[model samples]
Target: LAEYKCNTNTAIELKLVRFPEDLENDIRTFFPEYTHQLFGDDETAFGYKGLKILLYYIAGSLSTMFRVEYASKVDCVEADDVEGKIRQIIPPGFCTNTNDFLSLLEKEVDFKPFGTLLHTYSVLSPTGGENFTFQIYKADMTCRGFREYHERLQTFLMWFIETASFIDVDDERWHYFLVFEKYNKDGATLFATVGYMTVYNYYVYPDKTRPRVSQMLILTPFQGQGHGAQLLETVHRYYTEFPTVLDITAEDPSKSYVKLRDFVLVKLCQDLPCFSREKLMQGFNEDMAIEAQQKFKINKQHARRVYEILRLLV
Candidate 1:
């Protein structure tokens, strides 16, 4: 190998992918504090067309898995009424008295897989003129819009993450970035659920503007299509427009995510004035950091690393 060579690898091995015959029992085997219940008019809820998974988590571990099925299709929900409905189904403090909660749902009839539209964007396909559109939502209890869809979305996290647990839906600091693909079914414009990112806006001590990306995922079906790169780039570009934003960062990013981050950030800073060859050879310095922060909105630590990678040689 030559000194100019660089090592690279792409492909994520996701292991928790096998869905068996009886889906309910499979989940119970994975998680201990699990109780399966049915609400639909069929043998299994997945096919019965109205299946929902209710979960209560305390500190990133599964505390209560309250499974529900619907006899009828779940009613279309609004952003405002969704949290109230969830509370009605799986009320707060119900974990302390599981019987009362289960008793309340003993006659529960309707269940719905969350489906709603939030935010959308598109990227021009590189090396061509094709457009790739994606949708993102600012999901929370107040949106009155995201109420009907959080459960279906959270259910998906299980396939990709080992310790996928429920997070408090009321926390305002939590931000969600979802990716959707536009498609057509019977001549009607439709959307397919694809990828998502969860970012927590951590109050950066004195800065108070630095928002750290808590979790990111490009579904197995959507990975390797440059979706992750584009999503990360879009997030960076979104923050760049914000004068208040110190920078966007990730929390313990996985190997794949790091690669995606590096690829996206390096490509973004390539054209900046500070990354020019004249300044690059000078090594990582305050000038580089200052220029990147002011012009590109990159954090100090990441901006310095970008410099080192580009200044590897004369």
Candidate 2:
């Protein structure tokens, strides 16, 4: 086993002498409580490898003064290709320089989120678009949790996107899932799961306008660790800077959703006041619509604030 740490004075560094064959088990032993039940049978250990690659890349990048930033801001500039940039930013060889790492990422890694990564990127670049903004959100979940939540949301949204015939399946909307495993002195004990989704809409008639909304979702086994809040803030920043976006949305719901909802109501109302609650609730039956709209208002505000804060941090 090895130890790694970083401070403001120096860049992050890894001090591993060798790779252990039972690395996954060894790491999990340290954080037995956080190990996902579904992970027990995942022999490929792709989650472990992905985590190592990401850490190596980050340490390598940080050693060069690439401060750890939120994924939301990076997404804004990186767009659909953020993962590509990330792979490049943290390329092979801990001893290599930043330029070398980037070069290797560009020339070597497949730039695809398959195998360990298990995700894909979809970009939305509009043609003849007058005014529009693109928003991105990053949320975290374990392989199992993410798969479950995504399957649920995908199933729910797909029907709406397909059968309903009101939503376009090819309208430049995309979601990416990122899995991360962390080990301490005892070994690998925790996993950080993140999800990213971006949306872009362009108005074709009446008052032409374009808007983008993005969000970040984070799931950790050890609740109240403050990681979720940090991630949510990162997502909030992205939305604030890109006000042109008309609507921002995320489907996942954790207990923290309540906190995020409250934050949004206070912040967005303070910044951009609106009375769309009544109009929004009108879509459903009276009572159901009112409840839904009330909740939506809270979540929308929370999401926007979270996105705004995250943008600056990232």
Candidate 3:
């Protein structure tokens, strides 16, 4: 009977905060992209005129805290269960209180990357012209506590990916590749989860394995920093070492993802003899297909795309 409503989109604030040792007094906050997965399809939370739902997570380890404030909530009818909805999506073991969450953040200072390190690269911060080192690690469910850690990581997809769903890490064939920011704080090296990609190796009839790239997220704070390209390139190089792996593929990729993939693939193929200026001008052929797969594990279709791109450069 009253005018009380809040658009969840505008009312909600999702933040990722980081606390470094030297910069302990300063906190870095990052906003995320989507929330319809938590709210209704219309993205409305009824029964509040002025609502502010703040969900905060410590950047590296993802220790979390949630708080909600509203000017007025509907009493005549039921107000939407905003906290309950978020609780269901955030997985277990989060701090609903600030104090407990801070203690968790303290523990995060010692957190390190899980599993075998696969690749390392550096990117210059867009805000500051300083170099930041990042490492890609090949992890699995067998890694001591990665299973729980992954729960925190996958939650980002629900807020960002349109059709995101949690993966079953119990499957033995699933390969997890994680990216982390490596930095030094107080003479001790520390790592924070930057983003990650999951690949599932499927058996091909009698002799080969097809490694398909599944969920890939370069967390909101780290997006547009070229980590995605480095992650994809490292994954490709990792699988190229395996002769039994047929090729690398992606599952239902988005347009933006395809764009990133294409750019990375073109860069990878540019230095190939088959994609050389003279050879590229000769046109796409079996040799290019054969060599791309043999050397880079690029599928024929992608190889063709690379040929077209290189031919333009030639």
How high is the lDDT of residue 116 in model 3?
90
* Quality of model 3 by C-alpha lDDT: 0.80
Error in Å for residue 303 of model 2: 11
> What are the lDDT scores of the predictions, listed in order?
0.52, 0.30, 0.80
After TM-score superposition, the amount by which residue 266's alpha carbon in candidate 1 deviates from its true location, in angstroms, is 0.3
Superposition error at 250 for model 3 (Å):
1.4
Q: Could you tell me the C-alpha RMSD of candidate 1 in Å?
A: 15.2
lDDT of 3 by residue, 172-233 (tens): 99999999987665676778778889998999999999999888988766777898899889
Evaluate model 1: give its TM-score: 0.58
Backbone atom clashes (below 3 Å) for every candidate: 8, 42, 0
Using TM-score as the measure, which candidate wins? Answer: 3
Candidate 1 lDDT score relative to the true structure = 0.52
Better of 2 and 3 by TM-score: 3
What is candidate 2's lDDT per residue for 150-191, written digit by digit as tens?
432231121112121122333444324232333232342322
